[PDB]
Amino acid sequence: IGSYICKCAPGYIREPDGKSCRQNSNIEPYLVFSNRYYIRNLTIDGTSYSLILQGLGNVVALDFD
Amino acid sequence: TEFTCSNGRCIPLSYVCNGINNCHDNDTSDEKNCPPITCQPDFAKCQTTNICVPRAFLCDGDNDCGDGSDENPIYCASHTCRSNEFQCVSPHRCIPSYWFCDGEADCVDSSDEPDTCGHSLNSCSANQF
Amino acid sequence: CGDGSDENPIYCASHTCRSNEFQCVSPHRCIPSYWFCDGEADCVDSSDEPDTCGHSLNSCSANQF
Numbered sequence: 001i002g003s004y005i006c007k008c009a010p011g012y013i014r015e016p017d018g019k020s021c022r023q024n025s026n027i028e029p030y031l032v033f034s035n036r037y038y039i040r041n042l043t044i045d046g047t048s049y050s051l052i053l054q055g056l057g058n059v060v061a062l063d064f065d
Numbered sequence: 066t067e068f069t070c071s072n073g074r075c076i077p078l079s080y081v082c083n084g085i086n087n088c089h090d091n092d093t094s095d096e097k098n099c100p101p102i103t104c105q106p107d108f109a110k111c112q113t114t115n116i117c118v119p120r121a122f123l124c125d126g127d128n129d130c131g132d133g134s135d136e137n138p139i140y141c142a143s144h145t146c147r148s149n150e151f152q153c154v155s156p157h158r159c160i161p162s163y164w165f166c167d168g169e170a171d172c173v174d175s176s177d178e179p180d181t182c183g184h185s186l187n188s189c190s191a192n193q194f
Numbered sequence: 195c196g197d198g199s200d201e202n203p204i205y206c207a208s209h210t211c212r213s214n215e216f217q218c219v220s221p222h223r224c225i226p227s228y229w230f231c232d233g234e235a236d237c238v239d240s241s242d243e244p245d246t247c248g249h250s251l252n253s254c255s256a257n258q259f
C-alpha cells in the first residue's frame with residue numbers, strides 16, 4: 001500500500017539501489033562468442049579476454065552444458 | 066469502472082475483493098461481501114490483511130506485510146552472520162565475505178569497502194598484455 | 195506470554211509430525227509412535243489408544259513364571 005518492493009530470486013542479493021540484483025556465486029560469469037575462425041572468452045567484469053579455439057573453419061553457433 | 070462504499074468513497078471494481086479494506090469504512094463494505102481468501106501451503110498470512118506471502122519472506126528483512134507482521138522481532142531477531150559472510154552497520158543484511166572489498170558498495174552505508182580495504186592492484190598472465 | 199505473543203500462528207504453524215511420532219485430534223502435540231497404544235492416555239482426547247488398538251496380550255520367557 002503506497003509503495004512497492006523488489007525481490008531477487010534464490011542465488012541473488014539486492015543492491016542498495018533496490019531496483020537491482022547481484023548474483024551470489026563466487027565464480028565469475030563470462031561471455032563466449034565466435035567469429036569465423038575464433039572462439040573467444042571475455043569476462044563480464046572486463047578484466048579478462050582469452051581464446052578458446054583457433055583455426056576453425058566457420059563457427060556459426062555455440063552452446064554449453 | 067468504480068465501486069462505492071458506505072463513506073462516500075469509491076475504489077476500482079477490481080480492488081473490491083483484493084483482500085484489503087481499501088474503503089477503510091465503518092462497514093468494511095469492499096471486503097465484507099467477498100468469499101474466504103484461503104492461503105496456499107508454503108505461504109503465510111498477515112495479521113492486518115487477507116494477504117498470502119511466501120514463507121521465505123517472513124524474516125528476509127523487508128516489510129512485505131504492510132503492518133510489519135513479517136519481520137516480527139521475537140522470531141526474526143534470531144539471525145547470525147559471518148559464517149561465510151560480512152556485516153555492515155546499516156540494518157542487518159550480510160553478504161558473502163569476498164564481496165566486501167570488491168570495489169562496489171554492496172551495503173547502503175558502503176561500509177563494505179572503506180579506504181581501510183587498501184589501495185587496489187591487478188595482475189595478468191606472463192604471456193598476456 | 196499472557197498476550198499470546200508466543201505461538202504466533204504465522205511462524206509456529208510450520209510444525210509437522212509423524213516422522214517418529216503419532217497425532218491426536220486434540221490441539222496439535224505429537225508423541226513418539228510407540229506411546230500411542232501403550233495403555234495410558236498420552237493425549238487429552240485419549241485418541242492415542244481407542245479400542246481400535248486391539249485387545250491386549252502379554253508374554254514371558256520360557257524359564258519364567
Ligand SMILES: *[C@@H]1O[C@H](CO)[C@@H](O)[C@H](O)[C@H]1NC(C)=O
Pocket residue numbers: 090091
Ligand atoms: C460506526 O458508526 C457508528 C455510527 O456512526 C459509530 O457509533 C461507530 O463507532 C462506528 N464504528 C467504527 C468502528 O467506525
Ligand SMILES: *[C@@H]1O[C@H](CO)[C@H](O)[C@H](O)[C@H]1NC(C)=O
Pocket residue numbers: 103104105106
Ligand atoms: C483454503 O483453506 C481451506 C481450509 O479453510 C483448505 O485448506 C483449502 O485447501 C485452501 N485453499 C487454498 C487454495 O489454499
Ligand SMILES: *[C@@H]1O[C@H](CO)[C@H](O)[C@H](O)[C@H]1NC(C)=O
Pocket residue numbers: 144145146147
Ligand atoms: C551466529 O549464530 C550461530 C548459531 O549457532 C552462533 O550462535 C554464533 O555464535 C553466532 N555468531 C556470532 C558472531 O555471535
Ligand SMILES: *[C@@H]1O[C@H](CO)[C@H](O)[C@H](O)[C@H]1NC(C)=O
Pocket residue numbers: 209210211212
Ligand atoms: C511434515 O513436515 C515435513 C517438512 O519437511 C514435510 O513437509 C512433510 O510433508 C510433513 N508431513 C505431512 C504429513 O504433511
Ligand SMILES: [Ca+2]
Pocket residue numbers: 001002003004
Ligand atoms: Ca503500491
Ligand SMILES: [Ca+2]
Pocket residue numbers: 080081082083084085086087088095096
Ligand atoms: Ca479491497
Ligand SMILES: [Ca+2]
Pocket residue numbers: 122123124125126127128129130135136
Ligand atoms: Ca519480509
Ligand SMILES: [Ca+2]
Pocket residue numbers: 164165166167168169170171177178
Ligand atoms: Ca563491495
Ligand SMILES: [Ca+2]
Pocket residue numbers: 229230231232233234235236242243
Ligand atoms: Ca498411550
